[PDB]
Amino acid sequence: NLDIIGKRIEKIKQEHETSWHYDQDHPYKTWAYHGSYETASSMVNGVVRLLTKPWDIIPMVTQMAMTKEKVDTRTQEPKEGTKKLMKITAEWLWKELGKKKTPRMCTREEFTRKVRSNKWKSAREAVEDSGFWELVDKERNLHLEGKCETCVYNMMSRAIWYMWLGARFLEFEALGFLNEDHWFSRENSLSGVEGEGLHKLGYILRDVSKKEGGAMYADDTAGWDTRITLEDLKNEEMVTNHMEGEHKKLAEAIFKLTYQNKVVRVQRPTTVMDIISRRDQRGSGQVVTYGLNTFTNMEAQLIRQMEGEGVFKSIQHLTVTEEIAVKNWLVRVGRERLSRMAISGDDCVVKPLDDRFASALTALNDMGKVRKDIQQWEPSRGWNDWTQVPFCSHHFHELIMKDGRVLVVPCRNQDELIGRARISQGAGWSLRETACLGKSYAQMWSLMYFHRRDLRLAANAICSAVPSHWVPTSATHEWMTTEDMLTVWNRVWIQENPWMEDKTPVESWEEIPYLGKREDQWCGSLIGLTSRATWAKNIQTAINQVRSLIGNEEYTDYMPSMKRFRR
Numbered sequence: 001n002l003d004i005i006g007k008r009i010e011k012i013k014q015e016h017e018t019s020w021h022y023d024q025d026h027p028y029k030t031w032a033y034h035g036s037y038e039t040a041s042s043m044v045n046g047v048v049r050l051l052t053k054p055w056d057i058i059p060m061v062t063q064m065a066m067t068k069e070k071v072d073t074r075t076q077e078p079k080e081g082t083k084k085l086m087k088i089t090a091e092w093l094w095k096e097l098g099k100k101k102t103p104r105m106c107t108r109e110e111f112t113r114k115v116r117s118n119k120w121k122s123a124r125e126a127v128e129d130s131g132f133w134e135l136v137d138k139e140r141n142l143h144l145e146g147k148c149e150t151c152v153y154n155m156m157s158r159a160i161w162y163m164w165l166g167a168r169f170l171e172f173e174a175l176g177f178l179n180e181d182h183w184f185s186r187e188n189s190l191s192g193v194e195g196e197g198l199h200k201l202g203y204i205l206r207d208v209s210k211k212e213g214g215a216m217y218a219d220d221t222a223g224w225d226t227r228i229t230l231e232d233l234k235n236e237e238m239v240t241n242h243m244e245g246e247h248k249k250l251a252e253a254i255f256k257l258t259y260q261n262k263v264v265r266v267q268r269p270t271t272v273m274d275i276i277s278r279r280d281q282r283g284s285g286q287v288v289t290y291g292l293n294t295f296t297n298m299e300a301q302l303i304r305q306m307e308g309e310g311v312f313k314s315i316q317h318l319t320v321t322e323e324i325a326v327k328n329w330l331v332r333v334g335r336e337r338l339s340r341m342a343i344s345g346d347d348c349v350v351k352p353l354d355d356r357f358a359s360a361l362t363a364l365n366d367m368g369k370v371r372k373d374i375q376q377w378e379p380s381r382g383w384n385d386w387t388q389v390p391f392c393s394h395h396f397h398e399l400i401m402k403d404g405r406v407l408v409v410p411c412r413n414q415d416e417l418i419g420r421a422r423i424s425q426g427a428g429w430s431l432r433e434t435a436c437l438g439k440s441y442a443q444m445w446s447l448m449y450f451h452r453r454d455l456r457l458a459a460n461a462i463c464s465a466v467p468s469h470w471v472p473t474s475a476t477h478e479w480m481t482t483e484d485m486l487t488v489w490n491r492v493w494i495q496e497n498p499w500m501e502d503k504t505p506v507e508s509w510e511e512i513p514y515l516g517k518r519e520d521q522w523c524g525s526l527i528g529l530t531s532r533a534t535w536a537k538n539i540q541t542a543i544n545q546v547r548s549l550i551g552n553e554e555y556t557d558y559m560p561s562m563k564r565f566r567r
Ligand SMILES: O=C(c1ccco1)N1CCN(C(=O)C2CC2)CC1
Pocket: 517, 527, 528, 529, 530, 531, 533
């Protein structure tokens, strides 16, 4: 333990030798405390808020802009039968994921290009300073030597662990391939959805619905990242078994020194910097966190499926022939069972063979993946209709175009969409940068949420209010473009859509349908309210208010793309 974390602890004690104090009133039980030393609210987007006036009196919108007891927890050691199921399943899953992919190191060039597209002031500055890279080299050579000096986390149902850019590089070099080479694409992982836009996710859920079987289950885990066991981290580490030479050694060091042993500096108002350590839980880059969460979720859900199908009798202990049965299940039907699932990190949808899955809870609870908002042994409540299943914060509607073609569209409560577009993060936004962020939300709404009456109108208004040539600023983001949004809509929903056989382009926005008016209201629309009527009728006055603030620029009127403003 301290042989792996001591050097990092020693180095920090020195940069604060006139403060090091072993507080005895420390608030840590599950985190090991080592010592102490002496040591970003949401802003409103004015462009979006001025063009969404009716929502100024909707508390579900307005409260979103205003204003850890789970990290300090301890998950128990799984039983021996549970550990066997996880090791057999993880071994088989890394082999399947690796059948058509080659693990490889990511490069300083790739890392530099990422930072250049979002002592040293910023990341862009450090990437260019050859002094930085000489620091990376020292740490790198130390990792090859099996030791760590500078890979330390900083803390800040969310908890984000920043490290310095150098440590982030070493993580990206060893494990970036998982994301950069799409190991969790649907084509490669079967259950995954990595690189699938919101315009794909509903079609994927409808394809899972077409399988014979039981209800669709979408159980959320209570604090997934806090329930990652040291056994989970050891099964995730087995990806290094597919690696070779240097890469194998560099990846092994990231898992050993930074994931399976962690050093964290947390601020305590009491102000002292708390240097704490622990072996378990998730604490990695957010992108590596997504892939390893997807992997360990796919494993956990296949084991729950095995439990429901009776592949093993008890988690207490696998018999020798139960192990052969688990292996033979994976080889015989593993790829089919993966295709019965849609898994995005800690978020899953599973269509099992039948509803025995609902009460198959012993492995899931013993792995520590305890379900949110339900008693530990109460059977899961499944969904009978793919259009009601929650996934990635959405549900999905089946929408038939006047010409008979079928759109499967993403949806969520409209107060959440408007309340999020009204918020910026960070300081020093110019009026132009605030306008270009509003334009990014407006174009996302035109592409993904065109079927919501209020959002198509508000999107058209924002795009009318912001200069036509200004570039939108700050999954697939096809809305981040200055191309005409009708041309982008045709490319995404018709041309490139593998579920649409007839490729006839749409010639105008009037061909593109809305939800039913009652369904639009059920999902949050203000259609029918006097306020919404006054907003819609007077929208050119709101557009002109924003144009007057931005000043004398080139603007386009997009409002006559809608039937009601077309004379
Ligand atoms: O519900 C609707 C409507 C508009 C489009 C589809 O349905 N309306 C018409 C506009 N309205 C008004 O002008 C009334 C003064 C509020 C409210 C009733």
